[PDB]
Structures are given as structure tokens and as C-alpha cells.
């Protein structure tokens, strides 16, 4: 909210994109991230790789 310099999407990825001409992509598709609250859980493949891998 406060002390927020716009978005990191155009300060970090500012250089990252200009260095790669990726500007095009991150300008058309900007990063707002309306990220909701979601229980992290865990992908089952990892669980089975560790446990059921033998």
C-alpha cells in the first residue's frame, strides 16, 4: 500500500527485460499478481518420489 514504488515488475524486470528485449512481453503482460490465499499443499509426485519411489 504505502512505501510502494509502483510495482517491482518495472524496476527489477525493467533491467531484465531491457537487457533481453523482453520489454515487449512484460509490457503486454505485466505482473500485478492478484494472488489469493491458498493452502500450499504439495504435489503428489514429490511425495511418491520420496516415499513410494522404491
Amino acid at each position: 500500500s504505502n512505501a510502494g514504488r509502483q510495482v517491482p515488475s518495472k524496476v527489477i524486470w525493467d533491467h531484465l527485460s531491457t537487457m533481453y528485449d523482453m520489454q515487449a512481453l512484460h509490457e503486454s503482460e505485466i505482473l500485478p499478481f492478484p494472488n489469493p490465499e491458498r493452502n500450499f499443499v504439495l504435489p503428489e509426485e514429490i511425495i511418491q518420489e520420496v516415499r513410494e519411489g522404491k
Partner: protein
Amino acid sequence: SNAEVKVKIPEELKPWLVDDWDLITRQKQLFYLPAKKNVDSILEDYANYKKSRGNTDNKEYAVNEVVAGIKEYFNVMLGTQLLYKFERPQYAEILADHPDAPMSQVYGAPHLLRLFVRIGAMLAYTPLDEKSLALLLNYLHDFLKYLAKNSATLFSASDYEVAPPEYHRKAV
């Protein structure tokens, strides 16, 4: 049928991922304490590591801002996308008891790995080309490589303590 991004999470750290998960869900253990080995410190450690091996200007800021990217990426997901519903009590607890300390610090290394697990899913809805994504995954995998390398003295899942019934009263 969506062709979602397929990112291999370090299989060196898969046991650790399942361990962390096992602790929270199966073991009923929570992480209510500020760790000294925190994400930001590991980020800085990695950032300086790439510089100490080869002192450069061009790669210096590159590592620097990519690390800052992981920082902000972690900040936008930590309390929302990288947290279990059972960690809600400890979140409010640590947040209240230490309202001065950042969550990238208090939650230590164990919570760092969660970022890469969810980031691959969210980046599937924001699909750039293979090349830009490749450079991203390149430095991400490079970091994960170093992360797994030092993981023995990096991750301390043993700080997870079993949440007592009286503590569960904040989860119900």
C-alpha cells in the same frame, strides 16, 4: 489439455519438501519462531557467491536484481500462496510478537523452497517464450543447485514443534 510449464524441482530437495509437508500435516508440527538462517541472508550469500568466484560488473547487478526478484516474488506469495491453513495461527502470532521483523527472515530457509513449487504454477498462466523463461529458470535452478548444495547447514526443519491442543484452539 493446457500445456503448462514443467519445471523439475530439485530432487535433492524433494525429501525436504515432503519432510516440511509431513511436519505440518502428518506430524502436526508448526514453525512458530524466528530463524537466524533466513531467506534474505541466503539470497545475499548466493548473490555474493557468484561475485566472489568471478568479480564482474555485468553479472554483478544481474545476480543482484534476480535475487531481488526472488525477494519480491517471495513477498507476493509467502503469506498467501506459500502458507498452510495450519500456519495461519503462527503467522498472526509471529507477526504480532515481532512486527518489526520481515517474514522472509522469521520463517527461515524451510519456507523458501515453497516459492519455487507455486511459482511454476502461476507462471503457467503467464506464459512468456521459452527463451525468456529459460533464462529465468536458469538462474532459479542455479540458485536451487547452490541451495541444495549447502542445504545440510541451510535447512533446519527440526525447529518444527508439535502444536499442542491449546494452540490448535487458534486454528479452529
